[PDB]
Amino acid sequence: DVKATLSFSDNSPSVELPIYKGTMGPDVIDIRKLYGQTGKFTYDPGFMSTASCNSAITYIDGDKGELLYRGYPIDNLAQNADFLESCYLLLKGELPNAAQKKEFVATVTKHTMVHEQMQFFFRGFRRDAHPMAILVAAVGALSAFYHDSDPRHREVSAIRMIAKLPTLVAMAYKYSIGQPFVYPRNDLSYSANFMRMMFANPCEEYKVNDVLVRALDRILILHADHEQNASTSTVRLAGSSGANPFACIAAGIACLWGPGGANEAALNMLEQIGTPDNIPEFIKYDPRAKLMRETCYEVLNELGLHDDPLFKLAMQLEKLYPNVDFYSGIVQRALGIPTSMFTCIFAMARTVGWIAQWNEMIADPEQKIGRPRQLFIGETPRAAKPIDQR
Amino acid sequence: DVKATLSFSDNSPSVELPIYKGTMGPDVIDIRKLYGQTGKFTYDPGFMSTASCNSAITYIDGDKGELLYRGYPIDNLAQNADFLESCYLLLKGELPNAAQKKEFVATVTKHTMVHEQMQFFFRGFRRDAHPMAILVAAVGALSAFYHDSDPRHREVSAIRMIAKLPTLVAMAYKYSIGQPFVYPRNDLSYSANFMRMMFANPCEEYKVNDVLVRALDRILILHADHEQNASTSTVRLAGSSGANPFACIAAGIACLWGPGGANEAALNMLEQIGTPDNIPEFIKYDPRAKLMRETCYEVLNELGLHDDPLFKLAMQLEKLYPNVDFYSGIVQRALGIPTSMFTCIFAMARTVGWIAQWNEMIADPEQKIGRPRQLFIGETPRAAKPIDQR
Amino acid sequence: KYSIGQPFVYPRNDLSYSANFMRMMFANPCEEYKVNDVLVRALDRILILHA
């Protein structure tokens, strides 16, 4: 790649550092041979100025308001594809045709069921345990229940995680409220099946609402991947050591757990407010925002929640633009999803991204185990005393 | 800190980068304001030239053969302290006196037991499941069974993990071989208690061998921490997002899992060989090596294994110096520890290091969520087609 | 069902002997089980010939 840079010092000799250009975004400065020429490291807490890798999965530009999966703008993609199409895209690099989608959906459908032993495994959890705690433990236990899976095995594990994640998420919810597990349906779509596994009770037939299904499906698309981040880099970092894909994704969701989330934080704000707002206002571009706004509109109108306390959110909408997290929190609450499940939904959507990032890291010819450095500011060499002298 | 550096280019303007010196080791070059001045990132796959943080826990210099916990050389420390003293050191920053150790050991002892519900939880696992898979899932399930735990809570979680890790490890072993769990003993030391929970059968009283106990205890000390690495940085990375300590350690052990380990690789080599060696030789500094050599000597002599097939290892010792991984694999095999448990033992020792690294990351005033960058080499912006057109 | 990790399937009073067995064997909780009479008669004959 073109151009080069020079790193000069006061007394120490200088060094020449190669510069690589990408298809999109900032140029990168190669420092792979920095320490082996200067005897010095770079200092970058959080790696916010350090490119960990080269990727082809997702490009993001906050200033230009750009978010693209494999070259497709997020809003344009969502208007021409559902979630499983977006999964196929992130994994394969291209959007699927009619035949390719049919085969892919069929493969996912055939692996949605969770082994009965792993269902029994859930009964070991405390009944007062939080769903997210259950989910993290469940995903981290996938290796113990599915150890039969070389490039084909990486495909099997990928399909198994994508297919079983909604089932595991719904199982965590059902267990936390003391309701029996609901088995998936082959004739239902991805998001429709999840909605049923979540809310179908054995007392009545579950009526699938397409407006709610499309709403959930769009939320999943818009959170499928977010290039390099805390959880994604954790997946890549753990994978660089040669850990199995199940464990790496488990490491990712553990990181995604955090303290609540962005969706919950916005929703908790609205729940602390009535219709006024008047005293609260006195106390006081996103490509996905437009689509989620339309989604939030359709859901509230479909459910006839135009007269409910959620009107305060629609009023604050008109009266610092409302982000995707604002609408998502409203929609999920409208779908009957508890705030305790919000992070679970997040992990469910981000899982395909993690797998794609993991696959790319593995396939990378420069795949070496991650070994970050440090600046030692601790004790100088000292001598240990026999404990009776301390 | 003293000195500064200049980053020059061909056409683009130059930038001044501050340089910080540590108490030991290489200087670091501050690039926290690089992207906000040049519009460029650094390229460093594996972060092998990037200091992720400043630390006071462990310093390592391979060329000078240096490995120090809080300023104490690893060999000098091990000759004047046991494992729990080394744990106290890594966590508190100082070696404990008689009174401080007594209180610390008592605290660990009181938390060694695993809740019966979590014992029942193990019964959900398949009987053909590998111990490591069970352990990773178990550690990842700690949040679901211990959710009652601000600076005191971080101490409770630290003690709970250190105390219960040997119990969980031994439970995984016992479950994999179909033997009942063995409860800890308050009158036994850390390593003695682990050896008993591992090998005590309900058919006879377990005789504790001090030679074997000291051997295991030294192995734990020498693997307590290894500054920044794949698993440790994973713990720090996941922790930067605000994930609970249980989850971060679970994320760490998931990374430590890998493909087997170094100890197993060396042992598998010896098992493929007889006393000659003669045909194998024809086919063909570490501060910890000296201590482990003495340890390996004492163990083999104590167990009278001087005439066994392990003599091939002692013969290869005399006939590229034998590292710590060489002796450790021999000792653990002599202790009756299966190769399937080797990584479990590794995680058991490294856990205290992970906690120390996590504590330091949390206490750090520069604690921000990790956000590594990337070099995008993917698709340029394109337009999605309706699926019937694809 | 136990060997493949699928839940047990309860019998049906309106189904014949061999039809009921085929369902208890292959009916999954993800879709309604379609009973094929050709397959049922086939299984039923096998049972007769090995009674």
Contact A364, B8 (CB under 8 A): no
**3-class DSSP state for residue A118?**
helix
Indicate the angle between helix axes B324-334 and B342-363, nearest 10 degrees: 120
B232 within 8 A of B65, measured Cβ to Cβ: no
What six digits make up the tokens of A68? Answer: 């693209």
> If you measure CA to CA, which chain C residue comes closest to A185?
C30
Tokens of B223: 């693997």
Taking the CB of residue A128, how many other CB atoms lie within 10 A of it? 8
∠ CA A111-A107-A194, rounded to 5°: 55
Residues in chain C: 51
Mutate to test the interface with A, among C6, C30, C33, C34 (most CBs of A within 10 A): C30
The three-point CA angle A30-A36-A39 to 5° equals 105
Residue B136 structure tokens: 């990773």
Residue pair B146/B126 in contact by the 8 Å Cβ criterion = no
Whether B235 contacts A241, CB under 8 Å: no
Among the partner residues A116, A117, A185, nearest to C30 by beta-carbon distance: A185
CA distances from B85 to B90, B105, B360 (A): 9, 9, 19
Phi-psi region of B39 (alpha: psi -120 to 50; beta: other; left: phi over 0): left
Chain B: touching chains (3 or more CB pairs < 8 Å): A
Q: Does residue B247 contact residue A136 with C-beta atoms inside 8 Å?
A: yes
**Count of C-beta atoms within a 10 Å radius of residue C26:** 14
Task: For A302-322, give the DSSP string.
Answer: HTT-SSSTTHHHHHHHH----
User: Which residues from C are below 8 Å from A160, CB to CB?
Assistant: none
DSSP state of B312: H
Contact B2/A at CB under 8 A = no
Contact A384 B46 (CB under 8 A): no
C5 to chain A, closest Cα gap in Å: 5
Asked if A110 reaches chain C (Cβ–Cβ under 8 Å), the answer is no
The alpha carbon of residue B206 is apart from the nearest alpha carbon of chain A, in Å, by 30
Classify residue B24 by its DSSP letter.
S
Q: How many CB pairs under 8 A join A and B?
A: 500
* Chain A residues near residue B45 by CB distance under 8 angstroms: 32, 52-53, 366, 368
Phi/psi class of residue B182: alpha, beta or left (left: φ > 0; alpha: ψ in -120 to 50)?
Answer: beta
How is residue A250 written in tokens? 């488990």
Q: B8 to chain A: which residues are within 8 Å by CB?
A: 5-8
What's the N-to-C CA distance of chain A in angstroms? Answer: 60
Answer whether B386's CB lies under 8 Å from A82's CB. no
Q: Is C30's CB within 8 Å of A183's CB?
A: yes
Number of H helices, E strands in chain A: 18, 9
CA distance A302 to A295: 10
CB contact at 8 A, B259 and B130: no
Orientation of helix B245-257 relative to helix B151-177, angle to 10°? 40
CB pairs under 8 A between A and C: 22
Strands B4-8 and A4-8: antiparallel
Contacts (Cβ under 8 Å, ≥6 apart) of B135 = B168, B169, B172, B253, B344, B347
Q: Measure the N-to-C terminal CA separation of chain B; round to a whole number of Å.
A: 60
**CB-CB neighbours of A376 under 10 Å:** 24
What is the least distance, in Å, from the CA of B240 to any CA of chain A?
Answer: 8
- Neighboring chain B residues of A121 at a CB cutoff of 8 Å: 124-125
**CA dihedral in degrees (B211, B216, B217, B223; nearest 10)?**
150
Cβ of B27 and A49 within 8 Å? no
Which two tokens mark B384? Answer: 């999605």
HEC readout, B87-153: HHHHHHCCCCCHHHHHHHHHHHHCCCCCCHHHHHHHHHCCCCCCHHHHHHHHHCCHHHHCCCCCHHH
Query: How is residue B305 written in tokens?
Result: 């294994």
Q: How many CA atoms lie within 13 A of B333 on its CB side?
A: 22
Report chain C residues whose CB lies below 8 A from the CB of A115: 5
B356 touches chain A (CB under 8 A): no
Could you tell me the CA-to-CA distances from B121 to A215, A240, B117 in Å, in that order? 37, 31, 6
Q: Which residue of A has its CA nearest to C6?
A: A116
Inter-chain CB proximity B372 and A85 less than 8 Å: no
Q: Distance between CA B27 and CA B135 in Å, rounded?
A: 39
- Measuring CA to CA, which residue among A185, C27, A78, A169 is closest to residue B384? A78
Distances (CA, A) of B9 to A263, B31, B209: 43, 16, 66
Q: What residues have CB less than 8 Å from B316, skipping those under 6 apart? A: B270, B273, B277, B322
What whole-number distance in Å separates Cα of residue A270 and Cα of residue A329? 10
Cβ contacts of A1 within 8 Å, gap of 6 or more? A18, A19, A20, A21
Q: By three-state DSSP, how is residue B318 classified?
A: helix
Residues 6+ apart with CB under 8 A from B142: B160, B161, B164, B246, B250
Long-range CB contacts (within 8 A, 24+) of A194-199: A194/A166, A194/A169, A194/A170, A194/A348, A195/A335, A197/A166, A197/A167, A197/A170, A197/A171, A198/A169, A198/A170, A198/A173, A198/A174, A198/A336, A198/A337, A199/A336
* 3-state secondary structure labels for all residues of A334-363: HCCCCHHHHHHHHHHHHHHHHHHHHHHHHH
The neighbouring-strand residues paired with A55 are B376
- Please, what are the domains in chain A? 1-50 (2.20.28.60), 51-260+339-376 (1.10.580.10), 261-338 (1.10.230.10)
Give whole-number Cα distances, B134 to A333, A361, B128, B224, B231, in Å: 36, 26, 10, 22, 18
Residues contacting residue A186 through CB under 8 Å, at least 6 positions apart: A109, C30, C31
Enumerate the β-bridge partners of residue A15: A7
Q: Which chain A residue has its CA at the smallest distance from B41's CA?
A: A28
Nearest CA to A112 among A32, A60, A182, A214? Answer: A182
Decide if B382 and A254 are in contact by the 8 Å CB cutoff. Answer: no
Q: Which residues of A touch C28 (CB under 8 A)?
A: 113
Parallel/antiparallel/unpaired status of strands A373-376 and A4-8:
unpaired
Q: Which of B276, B284, B281, B283 is nearest to B312 (CA)?
A: B276
- Are the C-beta atoms of A204 and A376 separated by less than 8 Å? no
Residue among A180, A208, A185, A118 nearest C29 (CA): A185
For residues B299 and B218, what is the distance between their CA atoms, to the nearest angstrom? Answer: 12
| Nearest beta carbon to residue C29 from set A115, A117, A183 | A183
Cis bond before residue A286 (omega within 30° of 0): no
Which of A80, A373, A385, A389 would best serve as a mutation to test chain B binding (most B beta carbons within 10 A)? A373
Task: Write the DSSP string, A197-252.
Answer: HHH--TTS-----HHHHHHHHHHHHTTS--SS-HHHHHHHHHHHTT--HHHHHHHH
Instruction: Tell me which residue in A144, A229, A250 faces B126 most closely, judged by beta carbons.
Output: A144
Distance from CA of C33 to the nearest CA of A (A): 12
Q: Which amino acid does the sequence have at A76?
A: N
Judged by DSSP in three states, B274 sits in coil
Angstrom distance (rounded) from CA A88 to CA A77: 12
* Residue C32 at interface with chain A, using a CB cutoff of 8 Å: no
Q: Give burial (CB, 10 Å; 0-12/13-18/19+) of A192.
A: buried
Query: How far apart are the CA of B324 and the nearest CA of chain A, in angstroms?
Result: 20
Contact B372 A47 (CB under 8 A): yes
Per-window interface: B 248-277 vs A, CB < 8 A:
248, 250-251, 254-259
* A residues 138-197 lying closer than 8 A (beta carbon) to C: 183-187
Q: How deeply is B176 buried, as exposed, middle or buried, from its count of CB atoms within 10 A (0-12, 13-18, 19+)? A: buried
Please report which helix (H) or strand (E) contains residue A158, including its range: helix A151-177
CB-CB neighbors (< 8 A) of B390 in chain A = 95-98
Report the C-alpha dihedral over residues B204, B210, B213, B217, rounded to 10 degrees.
160
Cα distances (Å, whole numbers) of residue B349 to A309, B141, B194, C15, C38: 54, 19, 12, 61, 63
Query: How would you write chain B as a 3-class SS string?
Result: CCCEEEEECCCCCCEEEEEECCCCCCCEEECCCCHHHHCCEEECCCCCCEEEEEECCEEEECCCCEEEECCEEHHHHHCCCCHHHHHHHHHHCCCCCHHHHHHHHHHHHCCCCCCHHHHHHHHHCCCCCCHHHHHHHHHCCHHHHCCCCCHHHHHHHHHHHHHHHHHHHHHHHHHHHCCCCCCCCCCCCHHHHHHHHHHCCCCCCCCCCHHHHHHHHHHHHCCCCCCCCHHHHHHHHHHHCCCCHHHHHHHHHHHHHCCCCHHHHHHHHHHCCCCCCHHHHHHCCCHHHHHHHHHHHHHHHHCCCCCCCCHHHHHHHHCCCCCHHHHHHHHHHHCCCCHHHHHHHHHHHHHHHHHHHHHHHHHCCCCCCCCCEEEECCCCCCCCCCHHHC
Q: Provide the token pair at A91.
A: 């994994």
Beta bridge partners, A382, equal none
Asked whether the beta carbons of residue B238 and residue A234 sit closer than 8 angstroms, the reply is yes
On whether any CB of chain A is under 8 Å from the CB of B336, the answer is no
Tokens standing for residue A228? 């390099």
Q: Is A365 helix (H, G, I), strand (E, B) or coil?
A: coil
The residue type at C20? N
CB atoms within 10 A of CB B217: 25
Instruction: Tell me the structure's resolution in angstroms, rounded to a single decimal.
Output: 2.1
The partner residue sitting opposite C31, judged by closest CB among A115, A117, A186, is A186
- A117: tokens are 């032993």
Distance of alpha carbon B109 from its chain centroid, rounded? 21
Q: Which amino acid type is present at position A39? A: G
Mark A8-28 as b/e (b = at least 16 C-beta within 10 Å). ebeeeeebebbbbebebbbbb
B124: distance to nearest CA of chain A, Å?
4
Looking at the partner chain, which of B48, B93, B237 has a beta carbon nearest the beta carbon of A234? B237
A24/B378 Cβ within 8 A: yes
What letter represents residue B146's amino acid?
Y
Nearest to B137 by CA among A288, A381, A118: A118
Residues near B98 by Cβ (< 8 Å), separated by ≥ 6?
A: A387, A388, A390
Please provide residue A357's backbone torsions phi and psi, each rounded to the nearest 5 degrees. -65, -40
Instruction: Compute the distance between CA of residue B138 and CA of residue B119 in angstroms, rounded to an integer.
Output: 10
C-interface mutation test, from A181, A183, A193, most C Cβ less than 10 A away: A183
**One-letter amino acid identity for B84?**
L
CA of B183: how far to CAs of B114, B116, B162, B201, in Å? 9, 11, 16, 11
Residues of B with a known catalytic role: 325
DSSP letter, residue A327:
H
Question: Is the bond into B148 cis (omega within 30 degrees of 0)?
Answer: no
Pairing of β A373-376 and β B50-55: parallel
A46 close to A32: Cβ distance less than 8 angstroms: no
Reading the block at residue A27, the tokens are 């140029």
Size (chain A), residues: 390
Residue B73 has phi, psi (to 5 degrees) of: -55, 135
Tell me the C-alpha distance between B377 and B212, whole Å: 55
> What SS3 class is residue A61?
strand
* CB proximity A116 to C under 8 Å: yes
- Number of Cβ within 10 Å of residue A291's Cβ equals 20
The alpha-carbon gap from A139 to the nearest alpha carbon of chain C, in Å, equals 18
Contact state of C7 with A116 under an 8 Å Cβ cutoff: yes
Tell me which chain A residues have a C-beta less than 8 angstroms from the C-beta of B30. Answer: 42-44
Alpha-carbon radius of gyration of chain A:
24
Do B248 and B353 meet the contact criterion of CB atoms below 8 Å apart? no
Contact B388 A98 (CB under 8 A): yes
Instruction: Say whether A278 sits in a helix, a strand or coil.
Output: helix
Distances (CA, A) of B291 to A139, B79, B219, B221, B322: 40, 9, 10, 11, 12
